[PDB]
Design a protein around this motif. Structure first.
Motif, PDB file in Angstrom:
ATOM      1  N   UNK A 114       0.792  -1.242   0.000  1.00 63.61           N
ATOM      2  CA  UNK A 114       0.000   0.000   0.000  1.00 63.61           C
ATOM      3  C   UNK A 114       0.825   1.292   0.000  1.00 63.61           C
ATOM      4  N   UNK A 115       1.895   1.453   0.805  1.00 67.56           N
ATOM      5  CA  UNK A 115       2.693   2.689   0.663  1.00 67.56           C
ATOM      6  C   UNK A 115       3.508   2.780  -0.624  1.00 67.56           C
ATOM      7  N   UNK A 116       3.600   1.717  -1.420  1.00 66.06           N
ATOM      8  CA  UNK A 116       4.171   1.801  -2.758  1.00 66.06           C
ATOM      9  C   UNK A 116       3.148   1.414  -3.828  1.00 66.06           C
ATOM     10  N   UNK A 117       1.853   1.493  -3.500  1.00 63.33           N
ATOM     11  CA  UNK A 117       0.780   1.154  -4.430  1.00 63.33           C
ATOM     12  C   UNK A 117       0.256   2.360  -5.190  1.00 63.33           C
ATOM     13  N   UNK A 118       1.116   3.334  -5.494  1.00 62.17           N
ATOM     14  CA  UNK A 118       0.723   4.471  -6.317  1.00 62.17           C
ATOM     15  C   UNK A 118       0.454   3.961  -7.726  1.00 62.17           C
ATOM     16  N   UNK A 119       1.517   3.496  -8.394  1.00 63.08           N
ATOM     17  CA  UNK A 119       1.485   2.698  -9.624  1.00 63.08           C
ATOM     18  C   UNK A 119       0.742   3.363 -10.783  1.00 63.08           C
ATOM     19  N   UNK A 120       0.654   4.701 -10.765  1.00 60.20           N
ATOM     20  CA  UNK A 120      -0.145   5.506 -11.701  1.00 60.20           C
ATOM     21  C   UNK A 120      -1.595   5.020 -11.773  1.00 60.20           C
ATOM     22  N   UNK A 121      -2.241   4.965 -10.608  1.00 61.87           N
ATOM     23  CA  UNK A 121      -3.606   4.472 -10.467  1.00 61.87           C
ATOM     24  C   UNK A 121      -4.603   5.412 -11.149  1.00 61.87           C
TER      25      UNK A 121
END
Ligand SMILES: *[C@@H]1O[C@H](CO)[C@@H](O[C@@H]2O[C@H](CO)[C@@H](O)[C@H](O)[C@H]2NC(C)=O)[C@H](O)[C@H]1NC(C)=O
Ligand SMILES: *[C@@H]1O[C@H](CO)[C@@H](O[C@@H]2O[C@H](CO)[C@@H](O)[C@H](O)[C@H]2NC(C)=O)[C@H](O)[C@H]1NC(C)=O
Ligand SMILES: *[C@@H]1O[C@H](CO)[C@@H](O[C@@H]2O[C@H](CO)[C@@H](O)[C@H](O)[C@H]2NC(C)=O)[C@H](O)[C@H]1NC(C)=O
Ligand SMILES: *[C@@H]1O[C@H](CO)[C@@H](O)[C@H](O)[C@H]1NC(C)=O
Lengths: 44, 99, 50
Positions: B69-76
């Motif tokens: 989750x703290x690295x789940x940015x992933x260009x959402x």
């Protein structure tokens, strides 16, 4: 009047009683999403 | 896509799920059997106090471990509105999910 | 079992002992709080379906 079977047992880590332990054993319950199953999936 | 311990028969090409969807495949370039697990998703629940009192917000991501989750940015699709919480300055793991 | 009660206008039966019975009753209280993502269930990671 004996009450050790329905009063909670400190010997149990999950502090349910003896009869409650037998009740939780006889009812088959899936692990479901309480453990979230997420890293295990990433089975019904 | 991962490696699969499931061994196909030589005439077999695909492995399928309960809902008649593809789960295991045979790679065409090299004859090794893979398995398909769909990408991560979950629910988002927003915890707020009253707007009459304050404006600070906590956010819970349901059913997903805090390793992602703290690295789940992933260009959402919805990343610029939880971007400060996608960074994850304060991270807590519950049985509901990553808070 | 067939049991005819021996009624008479001068006669009564009174018990002289008793039993204390612990009878188990099972009652449901709550069920599974299922939540359904309609977009993910209907559309299997398809943008055009969404
Ligand atoms: C109340 O009942 C419990 C069990 O239902 C008794 O605890 C033990 O029971 C086992 C049999 O399963 C015996 O072998 C043990 O000797 C019992 N423990 C003790 C310390 O006696 C418990 O004794 C009962 N309470 C009373 C006051 O008799
Ligand atoms: C959530 O993530 C943590 C961290 O990756 C997992 O904890 C690890 O669990 C494995 C076995 O499952 C152990 O071998 C590791 O030593 C654990 N790591 C730490 C830092 O404790 C945890 O199991 C994950 N939970 C779920 C439900 O996937
Ligand atoms: C009512 O029934 C009870 C059933 O136990 C009788 O109790 C006696 O209890 C002692 C110990 O408490 C036992 O050793 C005896 O064997 C029991 N008697 C019998 C006949 O089993 C009680 O006596 C009865 N009372 C009446 C008035 O009938
Ligand atoms: C081409 O496909 C064959 C089987 O179809 C495979 O054995 C081979 O490794 C592939 N690549 C090359 C460069 O030949």
């Amino acid at each position: 009047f004996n009450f050790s079977q329905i009063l909670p047992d400190p010997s149990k880590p999950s502090k349910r009683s003896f009869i409650e332990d037998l009740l939780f054993n006889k009812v088959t319950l899936a692990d479901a999403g309480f453990i979230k199953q997420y890293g295990d999936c990433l089975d019904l | 896509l991962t490696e699969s311990n499931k061994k196909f028969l030589p005439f077999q090409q695909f492995g399928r799920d309960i809902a008649d969807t593809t789960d295991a495949v045979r790679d065409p370039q090299t004859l090794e059997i893979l398995d398909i697990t769909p990408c991560s998703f979950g629910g988002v629940s927003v915890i707020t106090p009253g707007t009459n009192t304050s404006n600070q917000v906590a956010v819970l991501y349901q059913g997903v471990n805090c390793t992602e989750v703290p690295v789940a940015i992933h260009a959402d699709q919805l990343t610029p509105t939880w971007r400060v919480y996608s960074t994850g300055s304060n991270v807590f793991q519950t049985r509901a999910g990553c808070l | 079992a067939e049991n005819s009660v021996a009624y008479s206008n001068n006669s009564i039966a009174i018990p002289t002992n008793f039993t204390i019975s612990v009878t188990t009753e099972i009652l449901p209280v709550s069920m599974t709080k299922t939540s359904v993502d309609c977009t993910m269930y209907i559309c299997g990671d398809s943008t055009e379906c969404s």
